[PDB]
Design a binder for this molecule. Structure first.
Ligand code: CLA
Ligand code: CLA
Ligand code: CLA
Ligand code: CLA
Ligand code: CLA
Ligand code: CLA
Ligand SMILES: CCCCCCCCCCCCCCCCCC(=O)OC[C@H](CO[C@@H]1O[C@H](CO)[C@H](O)[C@H](O)[C@H]1O)OC(=O)CCCCCCCCCCCCCCCCC
Ligand SMILES: CCCCCCCCCCCCCCCCCC(=O)OC[C@H](CO[C@@H]1O[C@H](CO)[C@H](O)[C@H](O)[C@H]1O)OC(=O)CCCCCCCCCCCCCCCCC
Ligand SMILES: CC1=C(/C=C/C(C)=C/C=C/C(C)=C/C=C/C=C(C)/C=C/C=C(C)/C=C/C2=C(C)CCCC2(C)C)C(C)(C)CCC1
Ligand SMILES: CC1=C(/C=C/C(C)=C/C=C/C(C)=C/C=C/C=C(C)/C=C/C=C(C)/C=C/C2=C(C)CCCC2(C)C)C(C)(C)CCC1
Ligand SMILES: CC1=C(\C=C/C(C)=C/C=C/C(C)=C/C=C/C=C(C)/C=C/C=C(C)/C=C/C2=C(C)CCCC2(C)C)C(C)(C)CCC1
Ligand code: OEC
Ligand SMILES: [Ca+2]
Ligand SMILES: [Cl-]
Ligand SMILES: [Fe+2]
Lengths: 62, 28, 447, 335, 34, 340, 35, 82, 37
């Protein structure tokens, strides 16, 4: 659970890092954001779940 | 001890999200 | 879409005056920055926060804000549970990502204008109906917010009351002052010495009570604007343009920035000296207390003690006769505080209570606040400009007051700037005098 | 009559008045007149004032032994503090003059009027179809008067600590300020002198450059000023010859060629600098003072190695230790 | 050919770093007070 | 002729104009700035003032300085090869040789620089009102950094080159000379303050009385670099100030000369006052005031108050500010108010 | 002394009313062009 | 509006410049660094090391008291392990 | 301090507050890249 918590929490960080850089260049260059509308959606969706994971999982470590 | 590792990445991140745009040329 | 053929680069954001869509992105991305700071800073504060140590000695300005709302604190401002601090911090920081998302989205992906992609959200600056309506929306949103405070205080836990009967403690307010004569009375109060206007609030009943009035009044005005338009005079008086509306809100914030500066500097109630530092007067009052306490223990009769000027070393009279502390502290005889009040009588400081009702907790309280006056340097060296390096400290009351005065002022400058431009933009000469039709050349010589 | 009130508003707003009495003027003119009249009478004939509230009257008027340089209008008593003290708050005028009554009457009326004076500098500009922001430049000297007459007393908790209305009295305000706040070691102040020095510098710069690059239209024994007529079409100086010179003094790209970019800089620099110096006094009104490098650099054993910052502190103590002789009863000066 | 905006932003950060190093030294070096 | 060929080369229009003046300017100007930047980081003031004055010792940008020589030196030029240093460089630094270095070099650099103004103006064929103006800064440097200490005991009492080291120079003149009470100084500030007003008010006047010569809001582009019509309405400017202030300019040629006169004249007056302080001929007191203050213990003005401040400054500062005097002031002899 | 207070108050009210009712009387109109 | 010199913009942009200055600029930096870190600077300018302001017991200042025999007097100040 | 678990992220949170400033800076990077239009 503890490591499982540090996994989710840390992964939530790297994803956000990828997301923060991703979304900009996505909407910017109109070379797509229709194939990236798939990528972005999966990242956004995943992000929320991760937050909820770390959320509940928090009351189990600390 | 040395969280300068953090700043560095988040610091070069800024110019990166527009540098990649100078490569893919568009919407600046 | 927008470049040099609109405004200059250093005036870039003015190219968005008529781009509702992108102009929304700015506001949503900006609002994220505010939530981001609030969140990221709280965690920064907590990460450095030391429980068994005064908050004002740790450079905190956000955790003491949470403390006031009755969260993680108890008797005498003792920090019990740091979890609420952690929560408030992390939740915000998360919400900043949500807001930042929409902000970035509306600014580089979504519709560059709103009028067509949705007539409800799209707007026209000169549309007095849409403007009063959008204003009506926010007037409600703020109104509910005012009641969100009322709720926390009366139902969800309470607030930190320094004036607590048994001594400073979290108390549930279950009797808000709803008497309009009392509430709105504050507005009719002087802003000078003694009568302190809004900052003179000294009990949570009025605070909670007043917020009930504001909460209702705000929403009431919120509905009014939804279902109406500006009158006649209202239209023949104001300037109706994107910049003009901005100027009006700029001067508004400026005024509130000044009021906030005096609040954090003077008020004792909504800014507890337990979480923040002791107020300026409070500190000077404490020194008189401290040395009145000391010397009296040495066998000095404070009541009849004669100072160099022959005025009263320890105790003297106010211009209206009240018994007050002596010395330069004669200017702060308007100070009121939990530690000092039990010594006060019907005519001011009672010589009998002073003589034998001084409590130990009061003595060390006076010593504490005396040695933590809001005096310091920019590089954070507590004390007078002539002090020696050792005590790294600057009262939070000092940080907040100075920072918000600078902001308030510059916003008054911003007001004048944007109000002056709007008047010239409207009438139509904000870009120079017409070479041909030069107005002055058509007016008689006064010589 | 087209309508009395309608005519009244037309007269007030009229741009055909020798002096533009604006709507702000309706407030300015009376307030400035009360301030000036009270001042003049005070400066000449006012009796001594117990400024520090310690029953130690300070005479600052001509008739009471002062000259122009020493004379001043003494700030209200420290016994009054931030209390409002109008004439109708005194048992008599004798009492009113003793507690520094005139001072409040002046500073309040002045600050009010000086604010509307800024308000009028917009109005006339509006009535004449010219751009505003002239008043914005005047916001800098006004914000200083505000900081010096109102903000600092509020912060310190008494109007007795506001700057006196006089030459030597202004000197006291400074010297003491330096002691209690170490203002010379404050960034905002330093920005102030920078704007002030730079201002005078640039004022001489522009002044000289222009007057040196004037087109010849005058005789050898005739004033060079007459080579200009009020209401000209073309320019009276070769801005292109001016730029050519100054461009060679330093180096081309470090020289202005745009008169509009020139005059903006001419206006921006001092206004911004004074804005900070005003914010400096307003910031140090809440005791956020200048840098404290006292006993900073110490040697390997722990001995204190002095700097110029320490020599400054010694001068500061002397001010502190001697100021307001009989006003202090306790060790720390928290007021 | 190296894009000007990159030259500035790199030399820019480079200045903030060295200058920020100076401000750190204000709390550690001989210029401290400890 | 080699001369005219030497001339040819020097007066060639480069990026950085050299000229005949440059032969004097650039060498001194560089050594002066360089000497400062050197001492600022490396050289100490321990053997001269008992002070740390460099980054190497821990001083920051504010507290660093190139301190004056010892009082023992007197008005010695302190040559590297002089009787004091005796060719030694390290000793030279420790005896505050860098001060006379910066001073004398900078002095000639200011000479070269005004000469540059004169030479360039002549070439461009413009009037030398830029050289006339620059005389005020010269007078100040000369009066303060040279004439003043030449009237005192030694270079030691000249202003040391540094931020804080100048602040003490201010406080000193207050405590010792009562410099603020000097009529010449007052004219000084009136010019600088009045000059900083002219600078502000004129620029703002111009920027807000401009004609519309473009269709953009940022009116900066809308300017004609090649003369022609006035870019701003002088006539409108006139009527404005004539109604808000009552008085107004109406002759650009006078307005600009006035902008020259005010700050230059002020700096010159302040110079004269300093020249008087060298012989200590200060404006310290008002005899009529002191005489009454002596007989009458209830007479108090803001003038008398200030002198007490001076007494404190002198007493508490002199010991560590004048080491060469071996001052010893017992606690009991130190002038103090009550409590403090 | 209580009288002086009344007089002043009246006086100040006068000018203050003149000010508010002043800008209210269609002030944006009063200008060279667009109104 | 132009003179002989090669436009800065071009030079600061040229790859050749950086090929040069990626070597030169850090070199000077490391050199200045060594200048201090090796304590050489202390000797070039006679600047006291943290352990060289006073003698162990002495609390007096080594003030130079006469111009001509100053150099000699200074050397004598270094003698007492100062 | 930060709850025992998150302690690993203590150094990370130490930098977070300054981030907003970077955005103000970033806007200048962009304008420089787009050659100040
Ligand atoms: C609610 C607040 C608010 C809002 C929405 C606006 C909005 C606007 N203002 Mg504005 N303004 C404000 C407050 C505000 N202002 C205040 C308080 C002042 C007084 C100083 C001004 C003074 C002002 C001027 C003088 C001008 C505007 C202009 C504009 C317009 C173009 C925006 C622009 O120029 O961006 C460009 C933004 C920048 C160039 C950034 C400036 C950076 C600032 C000066 C530095 C801040 C220091 C910072 C805290 C330190 C950071 C450290 C650093 C090392 C990272 C736009 C409509 C311009 C315009 O066209 O007028 C209509 C214009 O000329 N405003
Ligand atoms: C609060 C700060 C702020 C905000 C929100 C905006 C917002 C905006 N500005 Mg702007 N601006 C600002 C400050 C700001 N400005 C300052 C200080 C200056 C002076 C330097 C300017 C100067 C300026 C000019 C000169 C112009 C704008 C324009 C614009 C608009 C279009 C942006 C654009 O061209 O996209 C381009 C976007 C990119 C090149 C990519 C940038 C990367 C994104 C935006 C940032 C990503 C944030 C974060 C790291 C990612 C998080 C993702 C996560 C949520 C998953 C937009 C509404 C333009 C306009 O008028 O619109 C038509 C325009 O011409 N601005
Ligand atoms: C405006 C509100 C505000 C207030 C009242 C405070 C107050 C405080 N902060 Mg804080 N902070 C703020 C905003 C604020 N902060 C923001 C927006 C950020 C994000 C960058 C931070 C980031 C931050 C960190 C990371 C830390 C603090 C800390 C502190 C505390 C110590 C203060 C200190 O040493 O600062 C001294 C700072 C200065 C002297 C800098 C002043 C800078 C001025 C404003 C620049 C003005 C120049 C001007 C803009 C030039 C423009 C002109 C040009 C256009 C011509 C104090 C309680 C510290 C703490 O809690 O430790 C105890 C700490 O570690 N803060
Ligand atoms: C300032 C806030 C704000 C405003 C005014 C708008 C306005 C708009 N957005 Mg938008 N947006 C915002 C924030 C905002 N957004 C944020 C923060 C995000 C990030 C998640 C987005 C993401 C987003 C996307 C992805 C899209 C829009 C679109 C749109 C447009 C179509 C309307 C729509 O989608 O609503 C439809 C939804 C509703 C009418 C109901 C929403 C109600 C929610 C679920 C509850 C909100 C609760 C609230 C916080 C509390 C208020 C209650 C209180 C009074 C008691 C419209 C102009 C669309 C667009 O561009 O089309 C033109 C679009 O595709 N937005
Ligand atoms: C911040 C929120 C907000 C904003 C921006 C507005 C904006 C507006 N309201 Mg409004 N309103 C609000 C909240 C708000 N309202 C609330 C909460 C209510 C419920 C009480 C109302 C009830 C309301 C009514 C009933 C009316 C308006 C009207 C108006 C319009 C004209 C206002 C005007 O000309 O005032 C200018 C004010 C004056 C000329 C009077 C000046 C005298 C002031 C009040 C005293 C001096 C102020 C002083 C400096 C401050 C000291 C504090 C004082 C207590 C001592 C304007 C669009 C009018 C309109 O057009 O209807 C659509 C109108 O008739 N409002
Ligand atoms: C032309 C530029 C210039 C000028 C005017 C000066 C001026 C000065 N420098 Mg200087 N300097 C310069 C460039 C310049 N420097 C450069 C480029 C360097 C770097 C190498 C230095 C390095 C330097 C140092 C290291 C020192 C000075 C010092 C001085 C000062 C005293 C020097 C002296 O006694 O002059 C002597 C004057 C002359 C030699 C001129 C003689 C010219 C005649 C015509 C030639 C005759 C020679 C002939 C043999 C005589 C025969 C007579 C017979 C009876 C024997 C003086 C203010 C000293 C100082 O500041 O002391 C505090 C000092 O120590 N300088
Ligand atoms: C080519 C272009 C370059 C031309 C150079 C011309 C000279 C420019 C001015 C030089 C400034 C030097 C500042 C510096 O060295 O500080 C260097 C110092 C060194 O820092 C110190 O290091 C010491 C080491 O023991 C101590 O540790 C001190 O604690 C520490 O402060 O940095 C500072 O702390 C100050 C910050 C820099 C602030 C400079 C602002 C200057 C503004 C005025 C500009 C002139 C007008
Ligand atoms: C005595 C004078 C000694 C000068 C010694 C050389 C100095 C070299 C300076 C190079 C800068 C330059 O060339 O301009 C750099 C650029 C000019 O850009 C120029 O573009 C030209 C186009 O043909 C050429 O390419 C030039 O090479 C290029 O320099 O900036 C200017 O536009 C204005 C610079 C004005 C700087 C004034 C000093 C202010 C410094 C700001 C610091 C505060 C922060
Ligand atoms: C990571 C992470 C995070 C964060 C994120 C973010 C939010 C980011 C951002 C970032 C950013 C936002 C960045 C930015 C940056 C910027 C910069 C770094 C800038 C710089 C600039 C400069 C350097 C400048 C330059 C110049 C000059 C100097 C001159 C003029 C020109 C120019 C402008 C060019 C989170 C929270 C998730 C968590 C943890 C992890
Ligand atoms: C002494 C001598 C000499 C000389 C030498 C020299 C000449 C040297 C030089 C030196 C030098 C020449 C040095 C330099 C230095 C510089 C520096 C050290 C700088 C720094 C800077 C900075 C730090 C910056 C900062 C800033 C600013 C100011 C702006 C804003 C921002 C910033 C922050 C960037 C000789 C041998 C001849 C002889 C003997 C004596
Ligand atoms: C428009 C535009 C702009 C602006 C932009 C902006 C303003 C943006 C914003 C953005 C934003 C507003 C963002 C936000 C973000 C946030 C985030 C991303 C979050 C994160 C979170 C997390 C990650 C979680 C968690 C945690 C905890 C709970 C504790 C431990 C640690 C951590 C942190 C992990 C600019 C100027 C540039 C340019 C122009 C255009
Ligand atoms: Mn006039 Ca400012 Mn030194 Mn407490 Mn009194
Ligand atoms: Ca940490
Ligand atoms: Cl005094
Ligand atoms: Fe001009």
């Amino acid at each position: 659970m503890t490591i499982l918590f540090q996994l989710a929490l840390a992964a939530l960080v790297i994803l956000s890092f990828v997301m923060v850089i991703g979304v900009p260049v996505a909407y910017a260059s109109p070379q797509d954001w229709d194939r990236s509308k798939q990528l972005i959606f999966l990242g956004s969706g995943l992000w929320i779940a991760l937050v909820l994971v770390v959320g509940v999982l928090n009351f189990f470590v600390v | 001890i040395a969280q300068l590792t953090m700043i560095a990445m988040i610091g070069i991140a800024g110019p990166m999200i527009i540098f990649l745009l100078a490569v893919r040329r568009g919407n600046l | 879409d927008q470049e040099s053929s609109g405004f200059a680069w250093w005036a870039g954001n003015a190219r968005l005056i008529n781009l509702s869509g992108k102009l929304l992105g700015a506001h949503v991305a900006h609002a994220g920055l505010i939530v981001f700071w609030a969140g990221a800073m709280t965690l920064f504060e907590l990460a450095h926060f030391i429980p068994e140590k005064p908050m004002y000695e740790q450079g905190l300005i956000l955790i003491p804000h949470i403390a006031t709302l009755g969260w993680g604190v108890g008797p005498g401002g003792e920090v019990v549970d740091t979890f609420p601090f952690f929560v408030v911090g992390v939740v915000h920081l998360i919400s900043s990502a949500v807001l930042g998302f929409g902000g970035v989205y509306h600014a580089i992906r979504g519709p560059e204008t709103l009028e067509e992609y949705s007539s409800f959200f799209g707007y026209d600056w000169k549309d007095k109906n849409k403007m009063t309506t959008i204003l009506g929306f926010h007037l409600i949103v703020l109104g509910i917010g005012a009641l969100l405070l009322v709720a926390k205080a009366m139902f969800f836990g309470g607030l930190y009351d320094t004036w607590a009967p048994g001594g400073g403690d979290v108390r549930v307010i279950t009797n808000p002052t709803l008497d309009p004569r009392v509430i709105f009375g504050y507005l009719l109060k002087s802003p000078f010495g003694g009568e302190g206007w809004i900052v003179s609030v000294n009990n949570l009943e009025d605070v909670v009570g007043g917020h009930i009035w504001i909460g209702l009044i705000c929403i009431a005005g919120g509905i009014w604007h939804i279902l109406t338009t500006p009158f006649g005079w209202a239209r023949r008086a104001f300037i109706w343009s994107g910049e003009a509306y901005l100027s009006y809100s700029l001067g508004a914030l400026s005024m509130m920035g000044f009021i906030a500066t005096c609040f954090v500097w003077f008020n004792n109630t909504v800014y507890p000296s337990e979480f923040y530092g002791p107020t300026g007067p409070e500190a000077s009052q404490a020194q008189a207390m401290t040395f009145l306490i000391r010397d009296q223990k040495l066998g000095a009769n404070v009541g009849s003690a004669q100072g160099p000027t022959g005025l009263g070393k320890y105790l003297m009279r106010s211009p209206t006769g009240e018994i007050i502390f002596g010395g330069e502290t004669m200017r702060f005889w308007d100070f009121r505080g939990p530690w000092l009040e039990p010594l006060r009588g019907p005519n001011g400081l009672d010589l009998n209570k002073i003589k034998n009702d001084i409590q130990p907790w009061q003595e060390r309280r006076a010593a504490e606040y005396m040695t933590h006056a809001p005096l310091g340097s920019l590089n954070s060296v507590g004390g007078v400009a002539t002090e020696i390096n050792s005590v790294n400290f600057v009262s939070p009351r000092s940080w907040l007051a100075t920072s918000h005065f600078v902001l308030a002022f510059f916003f008054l400058v911003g007001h004048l700037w944007h109000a002056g431009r709007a008047r010239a933009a409207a009438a139509g000469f904000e870009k120079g005098i017409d070479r041909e039709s030069e107005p002055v050349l058509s007016m008689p010589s006064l010589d | 009559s087209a309508n009395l009130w309608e005519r009244f508003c037309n007269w007030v707003t009229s741009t055909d008045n020798r002096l533009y009495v604006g709507w702000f003027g309706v407030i300015m003119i009376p307030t400035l007149l009360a301030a000036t009249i009270c001042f003049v009478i005070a400066f000449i004939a006012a009796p001594p004032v117990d400024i520090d509230g310690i029953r130690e009257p300070v005479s600052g008027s001509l008739l009471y032994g002062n000259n122009i340089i020493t004379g001043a209008v003494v700030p209200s008593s420290n016994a009054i503090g931030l209390h409002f003290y109008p004439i109708w708050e005194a048992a008599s005028l004798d009492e009113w003059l003793y507690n520094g009554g005139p001072y409040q009457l002046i500073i309040f009326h002045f600050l009010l009027g000086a604010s509307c004076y800024m308000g009028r500098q917009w109005e006339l500009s509006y009535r004449l179809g010219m751009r505003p922001w002239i008043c914005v430049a005047y916001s800098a000297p006004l914000a200083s008067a505000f900081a010096v007459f109102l903000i600092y007393p509020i912060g310190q908790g008494s109007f007795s600590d506001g700057m006196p209305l006089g030459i030597s009295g202004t000197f006291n305000f400074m010297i003491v300020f330096q002691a209690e706040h170490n203002i010379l070691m404050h960034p905002f102040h330093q920005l102030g002198v920078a704007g002030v020095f730079g201002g005078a510098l640039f004022c001489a710069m522009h002044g000289s450059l222009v007057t040196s690059s004037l087109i010849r239209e005058t005789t050898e024994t005739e004033s060079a000023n007459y080579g200009y007529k009020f209401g000209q079409e073309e320019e009276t100086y070769n801005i292109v010859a001016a730029h050519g010179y100054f461009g060679r003094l330093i180096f081309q790209y470090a020289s202005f060629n745009n008169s509009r970019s020139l005059h903006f800089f001419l206006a921006a620099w001092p206004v911004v600098g004074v804005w900070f110096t005003a914010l400096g006094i307003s910031t140090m009104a809440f005791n956020l003072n200048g840098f404290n490098f006292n006993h900073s650099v110490i040697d390997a054993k722990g001995n204190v190695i002095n700097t110029w910052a320490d020599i400054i502190n010694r001068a500061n103590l002397g001010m502190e230790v001697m100021h307001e002789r009989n006003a202090h009863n306790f060790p720390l000066d928290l007021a | 050919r190296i894009p000007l905006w990159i030259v500035a932003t790199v030399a820019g950060m480079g200045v903030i770093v060295i200058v920020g190093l100076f401000f750190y030294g204000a709390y550690a070096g001989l210029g401290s007070s400890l | 002729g080699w001369f005219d060929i030497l001339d040819d080369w020097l007066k060639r229009d480069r990026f950085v104009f050299v000229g005949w003046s440059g032969i004097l300017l650039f060498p001194c100007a560089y050594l002066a700035l360089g000497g400062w930047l050197t001492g600022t980081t490396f050289v100490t003031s321990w053997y001269t003032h008992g002070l740390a004055s460099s980054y190497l010792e821990g001083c920051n940008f504010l507290t660093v300085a190139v301190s004056t020589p010892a009082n023992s030196m007197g008005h010695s030029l302190l040559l590297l090869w002089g009787p004091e240093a005796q060719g030694d460089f390290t000793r030279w630094c420790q005896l505050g040789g860098l001060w006379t270095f910066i001073a004398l070099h900078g002095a000639f650099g200011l000479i070269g620089f005004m000469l540059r103004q004169f030479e360039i103006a002549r070439l461009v064929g413009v009037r030398p009102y830029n050289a006339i103006a620059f005389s005020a800064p010269i007078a100040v440097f000369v009066s303060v950094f040279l004439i003043y200490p030449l009237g005192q005991s030694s270079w030691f009492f000249a202003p040391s080159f540094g931020v804080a080291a100048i602040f003490r120079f201010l406080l000193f003149f207050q405590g010792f000379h009562n410099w603020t009470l000097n009529p010449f100084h007052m004219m000084g500030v009136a010019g600088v303050l009045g000059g900083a007003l002219l600078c502000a008010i004129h620029g703002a006047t111009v920027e807000n009385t401009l004609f519309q010569d473009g269709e953009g809001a940022s009116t900066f582009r809308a300017f004609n670099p090649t003369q022609a019509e006035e870019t701003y309405s002088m006539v409108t400017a006139n009527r404005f100030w004539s109604q808000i202030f009552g008085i107004a300019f109406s002759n650009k040629r006078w307005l600009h000369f006035f902008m020259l006169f005010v700050p230059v004249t002020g700096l010159w007056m302040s110079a004269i006052g300093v020249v008087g302080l060298a012989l200590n001929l200060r404006s310290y007191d008002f005899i009529s005031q002191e005489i009454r203050a002596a007989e009458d213990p209830e007479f108090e003005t803001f003038y008398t108050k200030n002198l007490l401040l001076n007494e404190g400054i002198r007493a508490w500062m002199a010991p560590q500010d004048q080491p060469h005097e071996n001052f010893v002031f017992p606690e009991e002899v130190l002038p103090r108010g009550n409590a403090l | 002394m209580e009288t002086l207070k009344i007089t002043v108050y009246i006086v100040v009210t006068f000018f203050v009313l003149l000010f508010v009712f002043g800008f209210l009387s269609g002030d944006p109109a009063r200008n060279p062009k667009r109104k | 509006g132009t003179t002989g010199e090669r436009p800065f913009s071009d030079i600061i942009t040229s790859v050749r410049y950086w090929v040069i200055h990626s070597i030169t600029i850090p070199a000077l930096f490391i050199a200045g660094w060594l200048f201090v870190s090796t304590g050489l600077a202390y000797d070039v300018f006679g600047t006291p090391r943290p352990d060289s302001y006073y003698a162990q017991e002495q609390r007096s200042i080594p003030l130079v008291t006469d111009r001509f025999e100053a150099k000699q007097q200074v050397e004598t100040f270094l003698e007492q392990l100062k | 301090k930060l709850p025992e678990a998150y302690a690993i992220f203590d150094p990370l949170v130490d930098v977070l507050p300054v981030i907003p400033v970077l955005f103000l800076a970033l806007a200048f990077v962009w304008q420089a890249a787009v050659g100040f239009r």
